[PDB]
């Protein structure tokens, strides 16, 4: 069932939306 | 079990190789006789005063070159050059044989090489200085194998791989225990993409010397990455970090990239993906607290910030990387790719296509840049130009596993119609690649295959449509059900056609 | 999102070319190879006392072929008796 479980939003193309749900603050110089 | 650290291979070695080799205090006899002076290198040692004292007491050249080595470890390349130059002016080396002068000339050659490595600029000037020093060393003493090693490294930097390989063959004929010869040979073979031969050479170097600088385990991890055994690569990189916890941030960078790859290709669920991605971001930020101006880290973070709709900061980092690392073409290609991706949201199709072309010209290995270039050609409605470009790319790269390129080729050929067989081949290859990668097969490819097979084989079209319906599940549309019903009607399956029509 | 999936597939393959900075070999980096003029030979003969057995087990696990058997003897010339 691991073959069907691994198929999810990021594989379908919602990777950018998933990353957008992850918020983190960096020490950027720019 | 026994702890894997530097202290393990220290305790394996005798105490002579433990304590003496890492001494930070240098003992210098005086010219007055039995009097000696001990100077600790932990304190701020002045180059000029130490050189004047050494010249006055006329100490052995071993102390001069050891002080030069320590100042190399301190990063004082100019100070080490001053030490070498004043050593050549010292009475001891002038009264010694030409072997000592040749050794110090080779040390100056290594100083020029280290300056080139630490700056990655003024390559021609430092190479000429190093070549002159090495030529002087060879003329004064041609029997030193270190001169041959330096010649091989000089050929390798100038991409004269054949002559360097011949020099390393001569060195191997002289002796098979030369670790530096094995490392240089493996570096050349890796440069010639002979990963397996370099992997055996790296393993041999690791077995001979686990405490040799440069670290063979980095090359072993690179070879494991080339052989897809990235788990062993990460394990060897962790062992390398244990052995070398300082001045080895590149190992941490490779570990972060491997962790990102593992998160991308192994996360079984969205929550696990989020956890692994956040862990990779935290590890990358922790590595950034030591060096905050490393261009590769900014390039990696640009992907995350592009996914965060922070296009402005992506542009700032890309321009900064272009300004600093314009010598490296890969960073120029990556920055142009990210600028084109940013401009794609703005729909600057001409500007994005030009940026993709510049990225392609900078680094031809960027397949994503060429695919984005084809996408921009589609965006400007240049169907024929995109088709010709895609055919050229496919014929040049028939072994490349670009599944989306083949899917796009199949869709384009289906739109053309006359090239239906090429569409069948490309869509079947796309299906096979997706099955091998355990990725969700797009049902649109199955619909296109069914449309193509309508004029060839109704059975194959019906089977592909059934597979597409099973993939969609509840996402089945009216067109798919109607075509299934018509297929069963032509198949004289009255009951199944009636059910599909219902 | 198609280009995002392509980026995920490719990841950072062609960005590992710059990461070859560890391949460069320099004589002055090793601390104990230079302390005496013949320290290179001393270090080369210091590891002949060591072998695969002295290696750490995890590093032994890193030596993967890209056990002896009782019925393969090493040839001799004088025998015994």
Automatic annotation (TrEMBL), chain A:
Signal sequence annotation: none
Residues of the full protein shown: 485 to 514 of 514
Source organism phylogeny: Eukaryota, Fungi, Dikarya, Ascomycota, Saccharomycotina
Record's protein name: RNAPII-associated chromatin remodeling Paf1 complex subunit
Originating species: Komagataella phaffii (strain ATCC 76273 / CBS 7435 / CECT 11047 / NRRL Y-11430 / Wegner 21-1)
Automatic annotation (TrEMBL), chain B:
Protein name: Component of the Paf1p complex
UniProt TPR repeat ranges: 179-212
From TrEMBL, chain C:
Localisation: Nucleus
Family note: Belongs to the PAF1 family.
The protein's name: RNAP II-associated protein
Species per Swiss-Prot/TrEMBL record: Komagataella phaffii (strain GS115 / ATCC 20864)
Residues of the full protein shown: 48 to 137 of 393
């Amino acid at each position: 069932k691991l073959e069907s479980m691994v198929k999810s939003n990021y594989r379908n193309g919602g990777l950018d939306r998933i990353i957008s749900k992850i918020d983190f603050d960096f020490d950027l110089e720019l | 079990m026994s702890l894997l650290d530097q202290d393990y291979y220290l305790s394996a070695l005798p105490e002579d190789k433990r304590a003496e080799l890492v001494t930070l205090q240098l003992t210098i006899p005086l010219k007055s006789g039995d009097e000696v002076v001990t100077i600790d290198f932990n304190e701020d040692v002045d180059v000029s005063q130490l050189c004047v004292l050494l010249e006055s007491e006329n100490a052995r050249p071993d102390l001069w070159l050891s002080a030069a080595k320590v100042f190399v470890s301190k990063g004082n390349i100019a100070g080490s050059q001053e030490i070498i130059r004043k050593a050549l002016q010292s009475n001891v080396i002038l009264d010694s044989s030409a072997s000592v002068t040749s050794l110090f000339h080779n040390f100056s050659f290594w100083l020029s090489l280290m300056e080139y490595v630490s700056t990655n600029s003024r390559e021609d000037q430092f190479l000429e200085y190093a070549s002159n020093s090495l030529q002087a060393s060879n003329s004064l003493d041609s029997g030193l194998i270190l001169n041959g090693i330096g010649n091989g490294v000089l050929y390798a930097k100038s991409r004269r791989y054949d002559e360097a390989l011949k020099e390393f063959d001569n060195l191997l004929k002289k002796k098979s225990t030369n670790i530096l010869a094995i490392l240089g040979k493996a570096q050349i073979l890796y440069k010639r993409q002979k990963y397996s031969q370099a992997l055996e050479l790296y393993q041999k170097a690791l077995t001979i010397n686990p405490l040799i600088v440069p670290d063979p385990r980095l090359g072993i991890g690179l070879c494991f990455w080339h052989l897809n055994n990235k788990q062993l690569a990460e394990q060897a990189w962790h062992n390398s970090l244990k052995v070398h916890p300082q001045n080895n941030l590149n190992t941490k960078i490779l570990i972060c990239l491997a962790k990102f790859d593992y998160c991308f290709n192994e996360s079984k669920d969205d929550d696990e993906f989020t956890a692994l991605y956040r862990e990779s971001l935290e590890f990358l930020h922790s590595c950034l607290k030591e060096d905050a101006k490393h261009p590769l880290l900014l390039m990696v973070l640009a992907s995350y910030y592009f996914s965060k709709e922070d296009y402005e900061k992506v542009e700032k980092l890309c321009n900064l990387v272009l300004k600093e690392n314009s010598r490296n073409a890969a960073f120029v290609s990556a920055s142009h790719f990210w600028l084109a991706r940013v401009a794609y949201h703005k729909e600057d199709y001409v500007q994005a296509q030009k940026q993709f072309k510049q990225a392609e010209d900078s680094q031809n290995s960027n397949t994503l840049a060429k695919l984005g270039y084809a996408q921009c050609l589609i965006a400007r409605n240049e169907v024929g130009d995109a088709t010709i470009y895609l055919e050229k790319f496919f014929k040049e790269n028939q072994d490349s596993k670009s599944s989306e390129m083949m899917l796009l080729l199949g869709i384009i050929y289906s739109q053309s119609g006359k090239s239906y067989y090429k569409a069948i081949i490309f869509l079947e290859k796309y299906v096979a690649v997706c099955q091998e990668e355990n990725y969700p097969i797009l049902p649109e490819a199955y619909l296109v295959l069914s449309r193509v097979y309508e004029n060839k084989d109704l059975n194959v079209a019906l089977d592909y449509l059934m597979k597409a319906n099973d993939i969609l599940g509840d996402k089945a549309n009216v067109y798919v059900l109607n075509n299934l019903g018509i297929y069963h009607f032509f198949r004289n399956n009255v009951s199944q056609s009636s059910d599909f029509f219902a | 999102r198609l280009l995002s999936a392509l980026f995920s597939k490719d990841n950072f393959r062609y960005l590992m070319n710059e990461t070859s900075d560890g391949l460069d070999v320099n004589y002055l980096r090793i601390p104990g190879i230079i302390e005496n003029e013949k320290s290179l030979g001393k270090l080369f003969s210091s590891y002949k006392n060591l072998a695969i057995e002295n290696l750490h087990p995890d590093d032994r696990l890193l030596l993967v072929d890209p056990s002896p058997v009782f019925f393969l003897r090493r040839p001799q010339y004088v025998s015994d008796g």
